């Protein structure tokens, strides 16, 4: 199912504040995730796939022999904080720390970026780093310490100069929640990248295309596919919500409106949730929402009911 994702990043290079914007969406389901990222200060001061790692490990694709092992979708919807060493070979460092969680139906990854002691003409200051990315391995092994996972990868930076641009990254997870979370066994993560323009775009920007498969373990030997499934059936109901509110709004007090885009869900009220009965908030590209649901199948809808239908 596709899940939406909002990505936010405050970053510092050797006194180079910017920050980046990003949304999409991802299929766990089959480990594909496409987003845009806009350079939200201007002039981004750094290489574009210097920040690509930086910029949700949630949505890799767990065979069905793995998903005793997916300790990222186990953390939600609570989350889990990243943090990571990104350490260039022959220059700086990042230190980067995340937030992973759910905000209503979607995935939200706000980051804060530090970097020091980078070099002002080496590979990432000067700008000589090519806009591409390799594939890389993402060997994960649990960390029952700190009752989360630690993550070790080294990525591979291709420079105009036919050279090549080492990126040792250190990660350490740790869930937010209390409840309990899976703890794998070591395997790793398969990830393949792709990096392109929108040729319509005027700000400095990214586009992402990447898919991420988990393995390692043999064949010979859940609560997180069900719940971004869910979150899934969820967006695609406040599409159908919100292109029912405007449907309801033609024929109610005359108009011909058809919607561009969803923007913003929320779901409301101290009503219980055995009440199988919600009360959603939605803002339209040009509404409050009262639905009925079968308590035999949670997404199916017995009545819905516009309320108030007023673009701001």
Not at 211 to 240: D, R
């Amino acid at each position: 199912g596709v899940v939406p994702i909002l990505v936010e990043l405050d970053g510092d290079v050797n006194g180079h504040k910017f920050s980046v914007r990003g949304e999409g969406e991802g299929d766990a389901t089959i480990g594909k995730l496409t987003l845009k990222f806009i350079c939200t200060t201007g002039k981004l001061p750094v290489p574009w796939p210097t920040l690509v790692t930086t910029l949700v490990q949630c949505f890799s694709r767990y065979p069905d022999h793995m998903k005793r092992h997916d300790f990222f979708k186990s953390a939600m919807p609570e989350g889990y904080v990243q943090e990571r060493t990104i350490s260039f070979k022959d220059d700086g460092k990042y230190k980067t720390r995340a937030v992973v969680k759910f905000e209503g139906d979607t995935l939200v990854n706000r980051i804060e970026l530090k970097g020091t002691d980078f070099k002002e003409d080496g590979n990432i200051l000067g700008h000589k780093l090519e806009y591409n990315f390799n594939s890389h391995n993402v060997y994960i092994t649990a960390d029952k310490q700190k009752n989360g996972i630690k993550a070790n990868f080294t990525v591979r930076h291709n420079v105009e100069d036919g050279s090549v641009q080492l990126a040792d990254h250190y990660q350490q997870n740790t869930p937010i929640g209390d409840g309990p979370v899976l703890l794998p066994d070591n395997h790793y993560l398969s990830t393949q990248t792709v990096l392109s323009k929108d040729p319509n775009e005027k700000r400095d920007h990214m586009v992402l295309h990447e898919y991420v498969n988990a393995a390692g373990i043999t064949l010979g030997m859940s609560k997180g596919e069900e719940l971004f499934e869910a979150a899934a059936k969820a967006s695609l109901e406040i599409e159908e919500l919100a292109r029912f509110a405007v449907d309801e709004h033609n024929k109610k007090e005359n108009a011909l409106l058809e919607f561009v885009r969803v923007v913003k869900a929320k779901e409301q009220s101290s009503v219980p949730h055995w009440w199988w009965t919600t009360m959603y908030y939605l803002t339209l590209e040009a509404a409050k929402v009262w639905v009925k649901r079968d308590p035999n199948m949670i997404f199916k809808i017995n009545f819905k009911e516009l309320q108030e239908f007023k673009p701001v």
